[PDB]
Amino acid sequence: FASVYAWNRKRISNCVADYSVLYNSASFSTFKCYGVSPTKLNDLCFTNV
Amino acid sequence: GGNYNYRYRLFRKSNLKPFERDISTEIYQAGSTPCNGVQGFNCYFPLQS
């Protein structure tokens, strides 16, 4: 991974993201979303991630 | 000194009914694992001060 001052920026589009398989993973120290409840990301439709 | 006695409900299984009171204070499972009265991963206290 790149440094904090050179934070790596990636654009993802035209994909189907299954946030459930990331949600149930317990290996993450923090899993915290602001504008959306984490359980409904798979129920939302957007672009330009 | 900070007013902390004022709390609000933060999580529930579903939305309330008109003029309905909820006083139950039980751990809420945000994920796919049982909580068993433990406020840990994917488990949260529904009341927030």
mmCIF file of N, CA and C in Angstrom:
data_model
loop_
_atom_site.group_PDB
_atom_site.id
_atom_site.type_symbol
_atom_site.label_atom_id
_atom_site.label_comp_id
_atom_site.label_asym_id
_atom_site.label_seq_id
_atom_site.Cartn_x
_atom_site.Cartn_y
_atom_site.Cartn_z
ATOM 1 N N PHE A 1 0.846 -1.184 0.000
ATOM 2 C CA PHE A 1 0.000 0.000 0.000
ATOM 3 C C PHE A 1 0.885 1.239 0.000
ATOM 4 N N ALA A 2 0.359 2.333 -0.544
ATOM 5 C CA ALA A 2 1.091 3.588 -0.571
ATOM 6 C C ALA A 2 1.011 4.288 0.785
ATOM 7 N N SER A 3 1.797 5.354 0.922
ATOM 8 C CA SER A 3 1.884 6.084 2.177
ATOM 9 C C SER A 3 0.634 6.933 2.404
ATOM 10 N N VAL A 4 0.544 7.494 3.612
ATOM 11 C CA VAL A 4 -0.618 8.298 3.977
ATOM 12 C C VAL A 4 -0.643 9.605 3.192
ATOM 13 N N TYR A 5 0.518 10.243 3.013
ATOM 14 C CA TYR A 5 0.572 11.468 2.225
ATOM 15 C C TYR A 5 0.396 11.199 0.739
ATOM 16 N N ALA A 6 0.652 9.970 0.297
ATOM 17 C CA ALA A 6 0.488 9.589 -1.099
ATOM 18 C C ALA A 6 -0.590 8.521 -1.216
ATOM 19 N N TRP A 7 -1.714 8.734 -0.533
ATOM 20 C CA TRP A 7 -2.757 7.722 -0.415
ATOM 21 C C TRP A 7 -3.202 7.216 -1.780
ATOM 22 N N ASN A 8 -3.312 5.894 -1.900
ATOM 23 C CA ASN A 8 -3.623 5.287 -3.186
ATOM 24 C C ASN A 8 -5.095 5.488 -3.524
ATOM 25 N N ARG A 9 -5.351 6.086 -4.685
ATOM 26 C CA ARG A 9 -6.694 6.404 -5.147
ATOM 27 C C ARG A 9 -7.036 5.519 -6.337
ATOM 28 N N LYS A 10 -8.154 4.806 -6.240
ATOM 29 C CA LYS A 10 -8.574 3.875 -7.277
ATOM 30 C C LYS A 10 -10.030 4.120 -7.640
ATOM 31 N N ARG A 11 -10.316 4.090 -8.938
ATOM 32 C CA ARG A 11 -11.667 4.231 -9.462
ATOM 33 C C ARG A 11 -12.170 2.871 -9.922
ATOM 34 N N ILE A 12 -13.363 2.499 -9.468
ATOM 35 C CA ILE A 12 -13.999 1.242 -9.837
ATOM 36 C C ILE A 12 -15.387 1.555 -10.373
ATOM 37 N N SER A 13 -15.727 0.959 -11.513
ATOM 38 C CA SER A 13 -17.026 1.171 -12.133
ATOM 39 C C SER A 13 -17.378 -0.044 -12.977
ATOM 40 N N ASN A 14 -18.659 -0.127 -13.345
ATOM 41 C CA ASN A 14 -19.192 -1.226 -14.152
ATOM 42 C C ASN A 14 -18.924 -2.576 -13.489
ATOM 43 N N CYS A 15 -19.227 -2.650 -12.196
ATOM 44 C CA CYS A 15 -19.011 -3.854 -11.412
ATOM 45 C C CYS A 15 -20.206 -4.073 -10.498
ATOM 46 N N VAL A 16 -20.397 -5.324 -10.096
ATOM 47 C CA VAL A 16 -21.392 -5.685 -9.094
ATOM 48 C C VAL A 16 -20.630 -6.008 -7.818
ATOM 49 N N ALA A 17 -20.836 -5.199 -6.785
ATOM 50 C CA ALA A 17 -20.106 -5.327 -5.533
ATOM 51 C C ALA A 17 -20.982 -6.028 -4.506
ATOM 52 N N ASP A 18 -20.472 -7.122 -3.944
ATOM 53 C CA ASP A 18 -21.177 -7.876 -2.911
ATOM 54 C C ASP A 18 -20.586 -7.489 -1.558
ATOM 55 N N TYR A 19 -21.104 -6.392 -1.005
ATOM 56 C CA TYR A 19 -20.617 -5.895 0.275
ATOM 57 C C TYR A 19 -20.911 -6.841 1.428
ATOM 58 N N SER A 20 -21.785 -7.831 1.231
ATOM 59 C CA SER A 20 -22.090 -8.772 2.302
ATOM 60 C C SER A 20 -20.861 -9.581 2.696
ATOM 61 N N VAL A 21 -20.087 -10.042 1.710
ATOM 62 C CA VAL A 21 -18.922 -10.866 2.010
ATOM 63 C C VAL A 21 -17.834 -10.068 2.715
ATOM 64 N N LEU A 22 -17.833 -8.743 2.574
ATOM 65 C CA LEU A 22 -16.945 -7.905 3.367
ATOM 66 C C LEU A 22 -17.538 -7.568 4.725
ATOM 67 N N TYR A 23 -18.868 -7.528 4.821
ATOM 68 C CA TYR A 23 -19.519 -7.164 6.073
ATOM 69 C C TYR A 23 -19.336 -8.244 7.131
ATOM 70 N N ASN A 24 -19.601 -9.501 6.770
ATOM 71 C CA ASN A 24 -19.529 -10.589 7.736
ATOM 72 C C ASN A 24 -18.100 -10.948 8.118
ATOM 73 N N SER A 25 -17.102 -10.427 7.408
ATOM 74 C CA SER A 25 -15.717 -10.695 7.762
ATOM 75 C C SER A 25 -15.371 -10.006 9.076
ATOM 76 N N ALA A 26 -14.806 -10.768 10.009
ATOM 77 C CA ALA A 26 -14.439 -10.254 11.320
ATOM 78 C C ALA A 26 -12.982 -9.817 11.403
ATOM 79 N N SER A 27 -12.217 -9.965 10.320
ATOM 80 C CA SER A 27 -10.801 -9.615 10.339
ATOM 81 C C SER A 27 -10.559 -8.113 10.357
ATOM 82 N N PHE A 28 -11.596 -7.303 10.174
ATOM 83 C CA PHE A 28 -11.447 -5.859 10.081
ATOM 84 C C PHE A 28 -11.555 -5.224 11.459
ATOM 85 N N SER A 29 -10.572 -4.388 11.798
ATOM 86 C CA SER A 29 -10.600 -3.695 13.080
ATOM 87 C C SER A 29 -11.795 -2.755 13.172
ATOM 88 N N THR A 30 -12.056 -1.996 12.110
ATOM 89 C CA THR A 30 -13.151 -1.035 12.071
ATOM 90 C C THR A 30 -13.917 -1.196 10.769
ATOM 91 N N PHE A 31 -15.247 -1.191 10.862
ATOM 92 C CA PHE A 31 -16.143 -1.283 9.708
ATOM 93 C C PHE A 31 -17.243 -0.258 9.974
ATOM 94 N N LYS A 32 -17.014 0.996 9.582
ATOM 95 C CA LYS A 32 -17.882 2.075 10.048
ATOM 96 C C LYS A 32 -18.243 2.998 8.895
ATOM 97 N N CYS A 33 -19.533 3.051 8.562
ATOM 98 C CA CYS A 33 -20.054 3.876 7.480
ATOM 99 C C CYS A 33 -20.853 5.040 8.055
ATOM 100 N N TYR A 34 -20.908 6.137 7.296
ATOM 101 C CA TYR A 34 -21.492 7.392 7.767
ATOM 102 C C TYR A 34 -22.886 7.648 7.200
ATOM 103 N N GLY A 35 -23.003 7.758 5.878
ATOM 104 C CA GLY A 35 -24.273 8.115 5.276
ATOM 105 C C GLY A 35 -25.239 6.979 5.059
ATOM 106 N N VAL A 36 -24.778 5.740 5.194
ATOM 107 C CA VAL A 36 -25.587 4.565 4.899
ATOM 108 C C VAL A 36 -25.337 3.511 5.966
ATOM 109 N N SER A 37 -26.404 2.837 6.379
ATOM 110 C CA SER A 37 -26.257 1.693 7.260
ATOM 111 C C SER A 37 -25.540 0.567 6.520
ATOM 112 N N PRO A 38 -24.582 -0.100 7.163
ATOM 113 C CA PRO A 38 -23.773 -1.101 6.448
ATOM 114 C C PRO A 38 -24.575 -2.271 5.905
ATOM 115 N N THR A 39 -25.786 -2.505 6.407
ATOM 116 C CA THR A 39 -26.561 -3.660 5.973
ATOM 117 C C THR A 39 -27.265 -3.449 4.639
ATOM 118 N N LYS A 40 -27.341 -2.214 4.140
ATOM 119 C CA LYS A 40 -28.111 -1.927 2.937
ATOM 120 C C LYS A 40 -27.256 -1.470 1.759
ATOM 121 N N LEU A 41 -25.928 -1.589 1.850
ATOM 122 C CA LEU A 41 -25.087 -1.260 0.702
ATOM 123 C C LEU A 41 -25.397 -2.161 -0.485
ATOM 124 N N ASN A 42 -25.625 -3.450 -0.232
ATOM 125 C CA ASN A 42 -26.029 -4.351 -1.302
ATOM 126 C C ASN A 42 -27.418 -4.034 -1.836
ATOM 127 N N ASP A 43 -28.178 -3.182 -1.150
ATOM 128 C CA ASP A 43 -29.491 -2.751 -1.605
ATOM 129 C C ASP A 43 -29.471 -1.350 -2.204
ATOM 130 N N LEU A 44 -28.291 -0.820 -2.513
ATOM 131 C CA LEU A 44 -28.150 0.502 -3.100
ATOM 132 C C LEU A 44 -27.430 0.404 -4.438
ATOM 133 N N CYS A 45 -27.727 1.354 -5.321
ATOM 134 C CA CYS A 45 -27.257 1.327 -6.701
ATOM 135 C C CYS A 45 -26.640 2.677 -7.032
ATOM 136 N N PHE A 46 -25.343 2.682 -7.334
ATOM 137 C CA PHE A 46 -24.594 3.913 -7.559
ATOM 138 C C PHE A 46 -23.642 3.704 -8.731
ATOM 139 N N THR A 47 -22.688 4.622 -8.865
ATOM 140 C CA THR A 47 -21.664 4.547 -9.897
ATOM 141 C C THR A 47 -20.435 5.301 -9.415
ATOM 142 N N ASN A 48 -19.315 5.058 -10.096
ATOM 143 C CA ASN A 48 -18.061 5.769 -9.854
ATOM 144 C C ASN A 48 -17.603 5.610 -8.401
ATOM 145 N N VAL A 49 -17.312 4.368 -8.033
ATOM 146 C CA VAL A 49 -16.827 4.069 -6.691
ATOM 147 C C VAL A 49 -15.361 4.460 -6.589
ATOM 148 N N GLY B 1 -21.214 20.075 33.197
ATOM 149 C CA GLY B 1 -20.586 18.785 33.385
ATOM 150 C C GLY B 1 -20.941 17.741 32.356
ATOM 151 N N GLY B 2 -21.801 18.076 31.399
ATOM 152 C CA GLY B 2 -22.213 17.128 30.384
ATOM 153 C C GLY B 2 -23.461 16.373 30.784
ATOM 154 N N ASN B 3 -24.541 16.567 30.036
ATOM 155 C CA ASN B 3 -25.822 15.936 30.328
ATOM 156 C C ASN B 3 -25.882 14.609 29.584
ATOM 157 N N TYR B 4 -25.755 13.510 30.327
ATOM 158 C CA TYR B 4 -25.722 12.181 29.741
ATOM 159 C C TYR B 4 -26.954 11.349 30.062
ATOM 160 N N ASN B 5 -27.830 11.824 30.949
ATOM 161 C CA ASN B 5 -29.049 11.095 31.277
ATOM 162 C C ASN B 5 -30.044 11.063 30.127
ATOM 163 N N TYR B 6 -29.861 11.899 29.111
ATOM 164 C CA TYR B 6 -30.777 11.966 27.981
ATOM 165 C C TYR B 6 -30.317 10.992 26.902
ATOM 166 N N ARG B 7 -31.138 9.983 26.629
ATOM 167 C CA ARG B 7 -30.795 8.930 25.687
ATOM 168 C C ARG B 7 -31.892 8.795 24.644
ATOM 169 N N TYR B 8 -31.506 8.275 23.483
ATOM 170 C CA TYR B 8 -32.433 8.033 22.390
ATOM 171 C C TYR B 8 -32.185 6.657 21.793
ATOM 172 N N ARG B 9 -33.257 6.057 21.284
ATOM 173 C CA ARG B 9 -33.149 4.788 20.582
ATOM 174 C C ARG B 9 -32.366 4.971 19.290
ATOM 175 N N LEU B 10 -31.463 4.029 19.014
ATOM 176 C CA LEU B 10 -30.607 4.108 17.841
ATOM 177 C C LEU B 10 -30.775 2.955 16.865
ATOM 178 N N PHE B 11 -31.198 1.780 17.324
ATOM 179 C CA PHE B 11 -31.373 0.631 16.450
ATOM 180 C C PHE B 11 -32.620 -0.135 16.859
ATOM 181 N N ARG B 12 -33.289 -0.719 15.869
ATOM 182 C CA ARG B 12 -34.480 -1.518 16.116
ATOM 183 C C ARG B 12 -34.664 -2.484 14.958
ATOM 184 N N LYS B 13 -35.445 -3.536 15.210
ATOM 185 C CA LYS B 13 -35.752 -4.495 14.153
ATOM 186 C C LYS B 13 -36.546 -3.840 13.031
ATOM 187 N N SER B 14 -37.502 -2.983 13.380
ATOM 188 C CA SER B 14 -38.330 -2.307 12.396
ATOM 189 C C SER B 14 -38.788 -0.977 12.978
ATOM 190 N N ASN B 15 -39.454 -0.183 12.147
ATOM 191 C CA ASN B 15 -39.927 1.119 12.582
ATOM 192 C C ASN B 15 -41.080 0.969 13.570
ATOM 193 N N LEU B 16 -41.296 2.021 14.355
ATOM 194 C CA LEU B 16 -42.310 2.003 15.396
ATOM 195 C C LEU B 16 -43.699 2.225 14.805
ATOM 196 N N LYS B 17 -44.701 2.150 15.668
ATOM 197 C CA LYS B 17 -46.081 2.466 15.358
ATOM 198 C C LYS B 17 -46.439 3.832 15.923
ATOM 199 N N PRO B 18 -47.435 4.509 15.353
ATOM 200 C CA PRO B 18 -47.830 5.816 15.891
ATOM 201 C C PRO B 18 -48.269 5.707 17.343
ATOM 202 N N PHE B 19 -47.780 6.639 18.162
ATOM 203 C CA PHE B 19 -48.104 6.700 19.587
ATOM 204 C C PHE B 19 -47.790 5.383 20.291
ATOM 205 N N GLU B 20 -46.662 4.781 19.931
ATOM 206 C CA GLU B 20 -46.198 3.547 20.546
ATOM 207 C C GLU B 20 -44.927 3.816 21.338
ATOM 208 N N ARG B 21 -44.818 3.180 22.498
ATOM 209 C CA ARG B 21 -43.687 3.362 23.395
ATOM 210 C C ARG B 21 -42.802 2.125 23.366
ATOM 211 N N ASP B 22 -41.494 2.341 23.248
ATOM 212 C CA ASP B 22 -40.505 1.273 23.310
ATOM 213 C C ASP B 22 -39.565 1.561 24.469
ATOM 214 N N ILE B 23 -39.482 0.624 25.412
ATOM 215 C CA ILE B 23 -38.675 0.813 26.611
ATOM 216 C C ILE B 23 -37.708 -0.353 26.761
ATOM 217 N N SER B 24 -37.877 -1.379 25.930
ATOM 218 C CA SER B 24 -37.014 -2.549 26.002
ATOM 219 C C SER B 24 -35.571 -2.170 25.697
ATOM 220 N N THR B 25 -34.650 -2.692 26.503
ATOM 221 C CA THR B 25 -33.221 -2.414 26.379
ATOM 222 C C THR B 25 -32.495 -3.746 26.211
ATOM 223 N N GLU B 26 -32.361 -4.187 24.964
ATOM 224 C CA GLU B 26 -31.703 -5.443 24.642
ATOM 225 C C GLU B 26 -30.633 -5.202 23.588
ATOM 226 N N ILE B 27 -29.553 -5.984 23.674
ATOM 227 C CA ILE B 27 -28.474 -5.884 22.700
ATOM 228 C C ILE B 27 -29.030 -6.143 21.305
ATOM 229 N N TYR B 28 -28.488 -5.444 20.312
ATOM 230 C CA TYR B 28 -28.933 -5.578 18.934
ATOM 231 C C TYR B 28 -27.819 -6.190 18.102
ATOM 232 N N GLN B 29 -28.151 -7.251 17.370
ATOM 233 C CA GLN B 29 -27.199 -7.951 16.516
ATOM 234 C C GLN B 29 -27.176 -7.272 15.153
ATOM 235 N N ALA B 30 -26.089 -6.559 14.864
ATOM 236 C CA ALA B 30 -25.941 -5.895 13.577
ATOM 237 C C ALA B 30 -25.424 -6.819 12.484
ATOM 238 N N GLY B 31 -24.901 -7.989 12.837
ATOM 239 C CA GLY B 31 -24.331 -8.884 11.850
ATOM 240 C C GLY B 31 -24.975 -10.253 11.814
ATOM 241 N N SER B 32 -24.162 -11.287 11.600
ATOM 242 C CA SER B 32 -24.643 -12.655 11.465
ATOM 243 C C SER B 32 -24.202 -13.547 12.620
ATOM 244 N N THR B 33 -23.820 -12.960 13.753
ATOM 245 C CA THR B 33 -23.390 -13.757 14.886
ATOM 246 C C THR B 33 -24.211 -13.421 16.126
ATOM 247 N N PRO B 34 -24.543 -14.416 16.948
ATOM 248 C CA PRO B 34 -25.295 -14.136 18.175
ATOM 249 C C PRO B 34 -24.496 -13.263 19.130
ATOM 250 N N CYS B 35 -25.217 -12.430 19.877
ATOM 251 C CA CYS B 35 -24.588 -11.532 20.837
ATOM 252 C C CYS B 35 -24.569 -12.111 22.244
ATOM 253 N N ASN B 36 -25.659 -12.759 22.657
ATOM 254 C CA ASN B 36 -25.764 -13.368 23.984
ATOM 255 C C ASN B 36 -25.483 -12.347 25.084
ATOM 256 N N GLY B 37 -26.018 -11.144 24.909
ATOM 257 C CA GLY B 37 -25.808 -10.077 25.872
ATOM 258 C C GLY B 37 -24.379 -9.590 25.957
ATOM 259 N N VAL B 38 -23.666 -9.577 24.834
ATOM 260 C CA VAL B 38 -22.299 -9.076 24.766
ATOM 261 C C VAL B 38 -22.259 -7.984 23.709
ATOM 262 N N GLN B 39 -21.832 -6.786 24.107
ATOM 263 C CA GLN B 39 -21.715 -5.665 23.175
ATOM 264 C C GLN B 39 -20.333 -5.714 22.534
ATOM 265 N N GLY B 40 -20.208 -6.580 21.533
ATOM 266 C CA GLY B 40 -18.958 -6.727 20.817
ATOM 267 C C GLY B 40 -19.095 -6.438 19.338
ATOM 268 N N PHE B 41 -18.459 -7.259 18.507
ATOM 269 C CA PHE B 41 -18.536 -7.071 17.067
ATOM 270 C C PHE B 41 -19.949 -7.359 16.577
ATOM 271 N N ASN B 42 -20.475 -6.462 15.743
ATOM 272 C CA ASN B 42 -21.821 -6.567 15.182
ATOM 273 C C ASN B 42 -22.899 -6.614 16.260
ATOM 274 N N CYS B 43 -22.582 -6.145 17.464
ATOM 275 C CA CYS B 43 -23.530 -6.098 18.568
ATOM 276 C C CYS B 43 -23.450 -4.724 19.209
ATOM 277 N N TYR B 44 -24.600 -4.077 19.382
ATOM 278 C CA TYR B 44 -24.612 -2.697 19.845
ATOM 279 C C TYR B 44 -25.764 -2.457 20.809
ATOM 280 N N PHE B 45 -25.566 -1.491 21.698
ATOM 281 C CA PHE B 45 -26.620 -1.078 22.614
ATOM 282 C C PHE B 45 -27.571 -0.128 21.899
ATOM 283 N N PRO B 46 -28.875 -0.412 21.875
ATOM 284 C CA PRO B 46 -29.797 0.428 21.094
ATOM 285 C C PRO B 46 -29.920 1.852 21.605
ATOM 286 N N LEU B 47 -29.540 2.120 22.850
ATOM 287 C CA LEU B 47 -29.658 3.449 23.434
ATOM 288 C C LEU B 47 -28.343 4.200 23.280
ATOM 289 N N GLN B 48 -28.433 5.461 22.871
ATOM 290 C CA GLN B 48 -27.276 6.341 22.768
ATOM 291 C C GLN B 48 -27.541 7.605 23.571
ATOM 292 N N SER B 49 -26.566 8.003 24.383
ATOM 293 C CA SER B 49 -26.705 9.185 25.215
ATOM 294 C C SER B 49 -26.425 10.447 24.402
#
